Amino acid sequence: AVSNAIRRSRAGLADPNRPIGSFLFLGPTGVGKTELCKALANFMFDSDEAMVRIDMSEFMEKHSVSRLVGYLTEAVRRRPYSVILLDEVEKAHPDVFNILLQVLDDGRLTDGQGRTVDFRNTVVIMTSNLGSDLIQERFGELDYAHMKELVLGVVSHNFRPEFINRIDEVVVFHPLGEQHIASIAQIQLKRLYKRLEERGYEIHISDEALKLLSENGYDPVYGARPLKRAIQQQIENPLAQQILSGELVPGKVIRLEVNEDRIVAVQ
Amino acid sequence: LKKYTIDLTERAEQGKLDPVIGRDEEIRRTIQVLQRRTKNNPVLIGEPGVGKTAIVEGLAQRIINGEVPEGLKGRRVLALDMGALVAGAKYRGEFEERLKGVLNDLAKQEGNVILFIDELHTMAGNMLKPALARGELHCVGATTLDEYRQYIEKDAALERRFQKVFVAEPSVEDTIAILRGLKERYELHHHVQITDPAIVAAATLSHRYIADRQLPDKAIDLIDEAASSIRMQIDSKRLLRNKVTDAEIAEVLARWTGIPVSRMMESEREKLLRMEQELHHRVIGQNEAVDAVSNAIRRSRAGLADPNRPIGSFLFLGPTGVGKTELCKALANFMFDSDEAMVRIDMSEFMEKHSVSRLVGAPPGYVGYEEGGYLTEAVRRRPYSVILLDEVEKAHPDVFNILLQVLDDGRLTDGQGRTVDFRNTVVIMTSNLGSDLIQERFGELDYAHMKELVLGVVSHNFRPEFINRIDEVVVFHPLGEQHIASIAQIQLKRLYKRLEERGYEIHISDEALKLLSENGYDPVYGARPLKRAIQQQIENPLAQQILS
Amino acid sequence: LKKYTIDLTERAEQGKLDPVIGRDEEIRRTIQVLQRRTKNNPVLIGEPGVGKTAIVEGLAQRIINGEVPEGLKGRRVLALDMGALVAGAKYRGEFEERLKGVLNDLAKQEGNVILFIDELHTMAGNMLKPALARGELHCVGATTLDEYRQYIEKDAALERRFQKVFVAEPSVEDTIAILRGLKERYELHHHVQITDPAIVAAATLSHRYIADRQLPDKAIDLIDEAASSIRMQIDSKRLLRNKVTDAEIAEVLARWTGIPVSRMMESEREKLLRMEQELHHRVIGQNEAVDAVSNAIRRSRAGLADPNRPIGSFLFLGPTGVGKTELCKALANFMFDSDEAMVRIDMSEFMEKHSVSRLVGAPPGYVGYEEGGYLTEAVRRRPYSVILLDEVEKAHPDVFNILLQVLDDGRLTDGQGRTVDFRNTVVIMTSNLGSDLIQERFGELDYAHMKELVLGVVSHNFRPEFINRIDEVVVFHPLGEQHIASIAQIQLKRLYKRLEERGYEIHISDEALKLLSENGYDPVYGARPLKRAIQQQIENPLAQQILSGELVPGKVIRLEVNEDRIVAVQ
Amino acid sequence: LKKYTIDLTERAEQGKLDPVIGRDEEIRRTIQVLQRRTKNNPVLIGEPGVGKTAIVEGLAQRIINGEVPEGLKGRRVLALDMGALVAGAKYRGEFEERLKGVLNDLAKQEGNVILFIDELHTMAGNMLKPALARGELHCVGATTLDEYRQYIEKDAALERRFQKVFVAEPSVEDTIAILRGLKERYELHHHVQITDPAIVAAATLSHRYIADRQLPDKAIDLIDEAASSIRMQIDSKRLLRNKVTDAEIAEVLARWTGIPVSRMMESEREKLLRMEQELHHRVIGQNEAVDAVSNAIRRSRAGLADPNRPIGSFLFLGPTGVGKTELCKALANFMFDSDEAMVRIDMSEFMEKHSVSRLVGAPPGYVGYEEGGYLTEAVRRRPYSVILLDEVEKAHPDVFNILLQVLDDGRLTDGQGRTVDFRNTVVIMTSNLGSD
Ligand SMILES: Nc1ncnc2c1ncn2[C@@H]1O[C@H](COP(=O)(O)OP(=O)(O)OP(O)(O)=S)[C@@H](O)[C@H]1O
Numbered sequence A: 001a002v003s004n005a006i007r008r009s010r011a012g013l014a015d016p017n018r019p020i021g022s023f024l025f026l027g028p029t030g031v032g033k034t035e036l037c038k039a040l041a042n043f044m045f046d047s048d049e050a051m052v053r054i055d056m057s058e059f060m061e062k063h064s065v066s067r068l069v070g071y072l073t074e075a076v077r078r079r080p081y082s083v084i085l086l087d088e089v090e091k092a093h094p095d096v097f098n099i100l101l102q103v104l105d106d107g108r109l110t111d112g113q114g115r116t117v118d119f120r121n122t123v124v125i126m127t128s129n130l131g132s133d134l135i136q137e138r139f140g141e142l143d144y145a146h147m148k149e150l151v152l153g154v155v156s157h158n159f160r161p162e163f164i165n166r167i168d169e170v171v172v173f174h175p176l177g178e179q180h181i182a183s184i185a186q187i188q189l190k191r192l193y194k195r196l197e198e199r200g201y202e203i204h205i206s207d208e209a210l211k212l213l214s215e216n217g218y219d220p221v222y223g224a225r226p227l228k229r230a231i232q233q234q235i236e237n238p239l240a241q242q243i244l245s246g247e248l249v250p251g252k253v254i255r256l257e258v259n260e261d262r263i264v265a266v267q
Numbered sequence B: 001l002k003k004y005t006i007d008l009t010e011r012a013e014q015g016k017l018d019p020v021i022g023r024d025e026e027i028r029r030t031i032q033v034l035q036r037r038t039k040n041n042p043v044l045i046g047e048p049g050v051g052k053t054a055i056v057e058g059l060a061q062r063i064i065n066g067e068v069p070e071g072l073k074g075r076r077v078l079a080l081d082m083g084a085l086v087a088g089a090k091y092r093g094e095f096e097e098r099l100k101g102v103l104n105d106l107a108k109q110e111g112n113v114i115l116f117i118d119e120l121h122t123m124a125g126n127m128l129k130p131a132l133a134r135g136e137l138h139c140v141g142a143t144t145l146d147e148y149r150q151y152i153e154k155d156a157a158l159e160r161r162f163q164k165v166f167v168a169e170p171s172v173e174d175t176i177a178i179l180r181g182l183k184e185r186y187e188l189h190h191h192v193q194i195t196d197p198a199i200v201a202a203a204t205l206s207h208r209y210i211a212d213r214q215l216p217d218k219a220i221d222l223i224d225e226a227a228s229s230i231r232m233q234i235d236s237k238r239l240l241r242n243k244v245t246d247a248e249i250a251e252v253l254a255r256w257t258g259i260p261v262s263r264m265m266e267s268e269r270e271k272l273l274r275m276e277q278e279l280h281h282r283v284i285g286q287n288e289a290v291d292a293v294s295n296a297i298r299r300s301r302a303g304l305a306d307p308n309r310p311i312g313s314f315l316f317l318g319p320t321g322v323g324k325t326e327l328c329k330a331l332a333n334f335m336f337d338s339d340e341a342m343v344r345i346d347m348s349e350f351m352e353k354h355s356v357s358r359l360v361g362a363p364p365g366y367v368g369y370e371e372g373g374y375l376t377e378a379v380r381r382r383p384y385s386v387i388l389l390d391e392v393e394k395a396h397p398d399v400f401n402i403l404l405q406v407l408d409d410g411r412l413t414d415g416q417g418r419t420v421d422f423r424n425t426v427v428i429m430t431s432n433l434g435s436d437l438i439q440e441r442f443g444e445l446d447y448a449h450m451k452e453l454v455l456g457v458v459s460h461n462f463r464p465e466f467i468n469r470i471d472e473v474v475v476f477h478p479l480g481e482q483h484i485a486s487i488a489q490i491q492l493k494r495l496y497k498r499l500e501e502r503g504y505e506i507h508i509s510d511e512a513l514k515l516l517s518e519n520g521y522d523p524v525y526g527a528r529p530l531k532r533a534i535q536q537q538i539e540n541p542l543a544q545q546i547l548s
Numbered sequence C: 001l002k003k004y005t006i007d008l009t010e011r012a013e014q015g016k017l018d019p020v021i022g023r024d025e026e027i028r029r030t031i032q033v034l035q036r037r038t039k040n041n042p043v044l045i046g047e048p049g050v051g052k053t054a055i056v057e058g059l060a061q062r063i064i065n066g067e068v069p070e071g072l073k074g075r076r077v078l079a080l081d082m083g084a085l086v087a088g089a090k091y092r093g094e095f096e097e098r099l100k101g102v103l104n105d106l107a108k109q110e111g112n113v114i115l116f117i118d119e120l121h122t123m124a125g126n127m128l129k130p131a132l133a134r135g136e137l138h139c140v141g142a143t144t145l146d147e148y149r150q151y152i153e154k155d156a157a158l159e160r161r162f163q164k165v166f167v168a169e170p171s172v173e174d175t176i177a178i179l180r181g182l183k184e185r186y187e188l189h190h191h192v193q194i195t196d197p198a199i200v201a202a203a204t205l206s207h208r209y210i211a212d213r214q215l216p217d218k219a220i221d222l223i224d225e226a227a228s229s230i231r232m233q234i235d236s237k238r239l240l241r242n243k244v245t246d247a248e249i250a251e252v253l254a255r256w257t258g259i260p261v262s263r264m265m266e267s268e269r270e271k272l273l274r275m276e277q278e279l280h281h282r283v284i285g286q287n288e289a290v291d292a293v294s295n296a297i298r299r300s301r302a303g304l305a306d307p308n309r310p311i312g313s314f315l316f317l318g319p320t321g322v323g324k325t326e327l328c329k330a331l332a333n334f335m336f337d338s339d340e341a342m343v344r345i346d347m348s349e350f351m352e353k354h355s356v357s358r359l360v361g362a363p364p365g366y367v368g369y370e371e372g373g374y375l376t377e378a379v380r381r382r383p384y385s386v387i388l389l390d391e392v393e394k395a396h397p398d399v400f401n402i403l404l405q406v407l408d409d410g411r412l413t414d415g416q417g418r419t420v421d422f423r424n425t426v427v428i429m430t431s432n433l434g435s436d437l438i439q440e441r442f443g444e445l446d447y448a449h450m451k452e453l454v455l456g457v458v459s460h461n462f463r464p465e466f467i468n469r470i471d472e473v474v475v476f477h478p479l480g481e482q483h484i485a486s487i488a489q490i491q492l493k494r495l496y497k498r499l500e501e502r503g504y505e506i507h508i509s510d511e512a513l514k515l516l517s518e519n520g521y522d523p524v525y526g527a528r529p530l531k532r533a534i535q536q537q538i539e540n541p542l543a544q545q546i547l548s549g550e551l552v553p554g555k556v557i558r559l560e561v562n563e564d565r566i567v568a569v570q
Numbered sequence D: 001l002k003k004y005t006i007d008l009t010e011r012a013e014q015g016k017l018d019p020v021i022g023r024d025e026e027i028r029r030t031i032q033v034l035q036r037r038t039k040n041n042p043v044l045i046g047e048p049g050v051g052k053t054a055i056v057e058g059l060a061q062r063i064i065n066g067e068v069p070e071g072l073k074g075r076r077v078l079a080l081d082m083g084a085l086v087a088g089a090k091y092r093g094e095f096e097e098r099l100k101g102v103l104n105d106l107a108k109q110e111g112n113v114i115l116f117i118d119e120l121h122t123m124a125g126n127m128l129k130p131a132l133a134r135g136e137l138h139c140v141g142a143t144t145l146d147e148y149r150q151y152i153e154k155d156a157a158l159e160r161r162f163q164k165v166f167v168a169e170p171s172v173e174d175t176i177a178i179l180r181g182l183k184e185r186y187e188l189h190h191h192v193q194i195t196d197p198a199i200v201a202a203a204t205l206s207h208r209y210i211a212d213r214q215l216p217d218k219a220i221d222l223i224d225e226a227a228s229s230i231r232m233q234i235d236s237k238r239l240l241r242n243k244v245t246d247a248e249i250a251e252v253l254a255r256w257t258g259i260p261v262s263r264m265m266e267s268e269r270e271k272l273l274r275m276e277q278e279l280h281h282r283v284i285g286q287n288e289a290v291d292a293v294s295n296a297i298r299r300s301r302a303g304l305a306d307p308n309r310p311i312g313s314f315l316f317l318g319p320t321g322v323g324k325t326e327l328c329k330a331l332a333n334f335m336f337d338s339d340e341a342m343v344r345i346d347m348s349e350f351m352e353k354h355s356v357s358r359l360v361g362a363p364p365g366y367v368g369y370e371e372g373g374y375l376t377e378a379v380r381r382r383p384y385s386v387i388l389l390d391e392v393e394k395a396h397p398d399v400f401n402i403l404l405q406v407l408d409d410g411r412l413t414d415g416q417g418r419t420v421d422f423r424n425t426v427v428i429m430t431s432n433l434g435s436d
């Protein structure tokens, strides 16, 4: 139900005199909050130059609009048929929403563009992905009993309810938790520890860095850097206490042992 | 003139130059800066096609007919073969290669020769300022204002010789006089007959819609295109019409501007008959009452308004969801001929008294100068627009006069450098302070009784100095319940685009209009959640089986 | 023609071409445009390095081995005279006689000759314009992508006769398959055995660490240059290694880029296992952990941090005089053996409304355009550096808005318009925020008992998650008297070497080093008043006594205590 | 063609090349890039003066001496001159037949000629691009780090063919070893005795006082110029030096950057102890100011000054009319013999945030970028000066930060990017703050 409006606006079903939607999209900081436009190099035109993403959270002053309005004819006009993004458009005033009130529809941009801006064959998307406070994940494995519960509590803190009932696709994934941040970000567990896949080598990890601390140092702000701060003490040179520089002979298996949170990886 | 002897005055004595008329207000400068002692090189500056032929190229036709001043007597206007004998080699370097072979003879002519324009912004000019620095080189030039201002900066080998003849376009009436002595060259070439009301349609009707060619340029080729549509009409392989009309001109004018004959071939009084009928193609109605504000723009053609004021000065009071968006665009659809004449600005921005310079413009030096204002830069962009000032009453309780100079003296000055003119505007003000009470009855025979409680209550944020400068306080006619059923079907048009694409018939008999009668006409909240009386019970389960 | 232009199929007949493995689509596509009626001339365009000549070198082995379809079997692939058409043709019309002679010798080759005009943008041009128009010339071009757009792309009738064939660069999975086929030519030239560990690790490693060449060309010349270093091994004066390995491929990448992927032959046990022991020689204090700047260079010496963000992103917050900028000169001295071997961007003239172009470069066509930017050129030139951003809060917020891109993406595009890998650099941002919250709270302050209480720069000048994009916000504690009494000594050993370079020996009785540490200690100002009390209680009488001839060189000078003073005597 | 036998290996055979020392890991990389079958073309890249022309002259001295691998033994390093290939190539296609006539008889040796295009970025030279890729010419380029950027990096199909074998600027300890192996070329051209104190103290003194140059080009020059000064004093009219000593190096730097370490022993050291008498001849009163100024000038002349910071950085707080900018005019009259020899900057002229762009200059791409700013330019010109930041009482942190680096570590960079060292200057800041 995210490309459902493509079955409802690109064909045209679900009352097209509307914005797309800015209710809750809860997420973890870095790995599934803003990443879901980096993994969209696989859909229709292969446009990796669609980078228009805006934080629109605490903009109360009237002096933050004069940067979007010289590189407009360097990236989008050589290849017109593309994807065009916008996400996290959540809490602003009509000082900046005055441009963005006819960008909900109408396709063709007349602010300083003026021409045929063929957004009926390009895409116009708005989402609001406020998953920061008042409800969060922990690490990435829970059930689906926390889908939609806060209407005036998570996104619409001090703004009108006519900004949160004009959404077609009132959808979200889970606030999963508790076990899985080294597996949604398995890029620094799988890929980095089959790094020496040759020379007869294989890096096996202990259950201390797998199931022991898989839950402990939970902070709801940082996420990805304490993965590289609670397991920052075993990767290359604490591994190179007995592996590198003279002990490259095969016939032994790489392992970690029962110690405290910093281990010398002896073989 | 040993190599060639190309003569403009010989082309005048043989009649190869076109017969010229008018343009004697600006031959009385071209000559006055030509027969002088110094500064003897005129340059005709304007838009491309203003009449640079009409002044210079007829002067050779004026020499042999003797009405030129003395001193200019016995002067032959010459030219070069510049356009075919600037060159002579194979490769580059031919910008001014063989100029010296044909510039040395001009010194010997002893104050008789006058060399032609030859597009003197293309002569740049490696040899010209060597040739012109003595001043004996006696010439005429002509270049457009984009190719006169951008071209040179401080050349005292050029501006020492050139005089600023900023030539201008004639008016509406003047270019009609040009075509009377120009229809004698089109009676022989196209072999047609040209009449007197036929030549007025080229000038005065293209004056409002066509601007890409100046006034004695667009009125000449519009004539000669119909005269080139005659043998296209006679000899398309019974239909012999060499007498052209204004209908032949208004044909090819409709194929050129983009707009058809349907809003072109009428007087403004003749479309005024169906003005309300074109108003009420998209206006919810109440045509027994709301034709007062229809008469105000109808009062705007005679001219008994203030000439130091815009066209209109009103108040547009009523509820929301009624015509706050609908009535304002339809005033621009008729006179202002546009769907983007809209300057909707909500005046809830005046929470600070420093926000006078944001809709108008910051001073030079203060932040907010590189982008200008809001109620100025859009009017700088569109000086031919209605202006719509949403929710006036939330101006600062100490600060106003944001809208008084626009109405009293008619003009307004932003903080940029140029005064903004508001003379071709109509102000539309929606200061809803006491008319948000549509829930009362108040509307069975009269619609002003809703307004009578406002004039006792709106004036604490208003002033007596402001309500004088707006003539007719026009009340919004309400959105009745039966009146939704006329103007709600224009939202459905994308599915109307869809239903003819699939060959199916889902056309109704009283099954989809009962939810279209739940948009507007509200007691408590408004039409923003009333729009969701449609999507959650029809659009989900009925037409999700249409892409499958 | 055949006397002059290089016959590429007759080079392939002798096997004098490199075996083009892969690229099956771009040879099919360049055939599918070669057998057309109108507009039948390809141009293999793409980045320089990707195989635009190796397509047509591989088409000429697809032709003589019959793997071409019918209709192009037995077709000769010919090059063009690469500047031998424009060789000693002094006389007017000799180049037109040479080019018509090698055009009219294709019209009497019936259309059985494919011209491979390599580097098409060096072309002439009007003389090929008729023969390309009528399909008589079956040309094949190979311009680059930038050389095929900035070199006569339109020019009237010249933007249709050539049909573009885009040669995209291989992936890493393709390039390993590229290198398996070519390795029998580098084994047979260097007389080494390139190993299959070393070809998967010459395409993975040169994809990460080479930002100008993420090509198939760049995996080849790690394969080609590791094999030449084995020729350095066995031709210079089981034990004499005949194989290149992934330890020999990486030793070229530690010399090509200069990024230390090599530690299986280093004293990392000696040098990189000095946790603070090499940094405590010059940064006394800051003992929250071992050092937490010798943990990000310890996570990634060969590179085992996240390879999409820099080696270390540190905010060095603290009071004044505590060692924030000295840790960036003791780390730059530890990595590169010189204090000044970092990219020190002081935020001097960084507040302006455009100083951004100072450290990233002017836009194209402006006045300082051809000289690059300060930050960008210093990391293109050496990708493994330390980048000190001193007093980063004293910069404009527009500076951070281009400095977000180096902290998360690890890649900062510049004003010229090229992207620069900061993924191997160490980006340190010293700053002075929270300076009052550390002198007050001597243990009560955590890292987050501060980093939101000071907020008018953390919320307004800093972004909400700009402090999330930096890896470790190290907070510096103020120097107690146990510290300043011990950096009296490392500021005095700096002073003894300043005098042994003049031939004077300076001794200090411990009554006097007790006296500097009393006169140079106040916790608000850190440790600059200590070394200000060295240069006014020690070096100020010493310079007078050295100048006036009162202190002979070669004798010892004992800075002993006098009546409330430090005096120097013989 | 055969108008080109430019043999850099017979210049090394006849002993006409200078001995190169200790770049045995950039030669070993230059060798092993030159020994691979596709694009064996190294490009000794690096800053000017670093030693990258003199790596190919250490290839040529190893090929002719047999310290190379035995697949590189007996090669020929040939220095291709761009100027000699374009000279006289007036007619059309004479350069292309000249370059192809070089490429042809480079191929006749069958890869036994190592071509050396010194200043590679000068390669009119349009057509070597296919032959560079196949390994048909073994082409050691040696271009600088900024001239590769603005010619060869622009030809992105040509910088593929070249492997940058980056030549880093050596340390002081690597320059003393470079200089200990080069002094017999300068002891023999000047007929002098360059002693080892004059080599340890010429890669030390030039490595700290010189910042506009590299490292191996500064120390080597100083000794080249101290020896040509000694031979001048040997000839022109024991007590004379046959011997370049460490004091003769400092005399060559004293009149090249401002002030030496060692010229002081005669009468300047008399008038440095007489400084507070000399400064009180124009600034009476304020002994505590004249003593705090004169101690910093003595701390530098004794070599005792912190070599990273400036010589002295003072704040002159006082009332009006008490001599705060009379001391800075009597200081610059003392050490430069003119009152108007300060880099004096009235700080009251930059009361705005944009006024800090006149002390450092405009950024790249602005007006007045190419002119610098008159604090960093006037200190880059004369590095030993007095900087009077007079009336230093502004309300802008942006304009104050500039002095965060001038006073600590002693550097401040142009808008142009050129870092100007303030470690030899005396920054005085005379404000009016404790006045009442
Ligand atoms: N598909 C391939 N199979 C084998 N070798 C390849 C392939 N693609 C490229 N190469 C090799 O990559 C190296 C350089 O590629 P080139 O094709 O010579 O460069 P380029 O991309 O053609 O740009 P040019 O040559 O200036 S037109 C050569 O050794 C080629 O053989």
Ligand SMILES: Nc1ncnc2c1ncn2[C@@H]1O[C@H](COP(=O)(O)OP(=O)(O)OP(O)(O)=S)[C@@H](O)[C@H]1O
Residues within 6 Å of the ligand: C282, C283, C284, C285, C286, C319, C320, C321, C322, C323, C324, C325, C326, C327, C430, C431, C432, C487, C491, C526, C527, C528, C531
């Ligand atoms: N922890 C330390 N260990 C050794 N020397 C130190 C230490 N802290 C300060 N110093 C000395 O103090 C001088 C100035 O300190 P710096 O660290 O350079 O400045 P800073 O501490 O980074 O703070 P600032 O002024 O905000 S940039 C250095 O040159 C050192 O000599």
Ligand SMILES: Nc1ncnc2c1ncn2[C@@H]1O[C@H](COP(=O)(O)OP(=O)(O)OP(O)(O)=S)[C@@H](O)[C@H]1O
Residues within 6 Å of the ligand: D018, D019, D020, D021, D022, D023, D047, D048, D049, D050, D051, D052, D053, D054, D055, D142, D143, D144, D178, D182, D216, D217, D220
């Ligand atoms: N390793 C070295 N051994 C001996 N002499 C050296 C060494 N490195 C540099 N030199 C000397 O340093 C001086 C200048 O170095 P060069 O290499 O000639 O110039 P460069 O470094 O190539 O810079 P340029 O101007 O861009 S050619 C010469 O006198 C060289 O002999």
Ligand SMILES: Nc1ncnc2c1ncn2[C@@H]1O[C@H](COP(=O)(O)OP(=O)(O)OP(O)(O)=S)[C@@H](O)[C@H]1O
Residues within 6 Å of the ligand: D282, D283, D284, D285, D286, D319, D320, D321, D322, D323, D324, D325, D326, D327, D430, D431, D432
């Ligand atoms: N202590 C002094 N010894 C000698 N001349 C002095 C002294 N103080 C002031 N003068 C004279 O007074 C003038 C110097 O004034 P300045 O010293 O330049 O101003 P200032 O004392 O620095 O304070 P200001 O007004 O804040 S710049 C010159 O004419 C000096 O000759």
Ligand SMILES: Nc1ncnc2c1ncn2[C@@H]1O[C@H](COP(=O)(O)OP(=O)(O)O)[C@@H](O)[C@H]1O
Residues within 6 Å of the ligand: B018, B019, B020, B021, B022, B023, B047, B048, B049, B050, B051, B052, B053, B054, B178, B182, B216, B217, B220
């Ligand atoms: N008063 C006039 N009398 C006769 N012909 C005119 C007159 N004004 C304009 N024209 C016609 O209009 C054209 C004007 O040419 P010109 O304005 O010189 O074009 P440009 O400015 O592009 O050189 C000519 O074809 C000329 O015959």
Ligand SMILES: Nc1ncnc2c1ncn2[C@@H]1O[C@H](COP(=O)(O)OP(=O)(O)O)[C@@H](O)[C@H]1O
Residues within 6 Å of the ligand: A017, A018, B320, B321, B322, B323, B324, B325, B326, B487, B488, B491, B526, B527, B528, B531
């Ligand atoms: N007369 C109308 N014709 C078409 N659509 C309308 C009309 N009035 C309201 N709407 C729809 O109702 C929605 C909300 O209207 P609203 O903003 O309350 O109108 P107003 O601004 O006049 O109060 C709009 O998105 C619009 O599509």
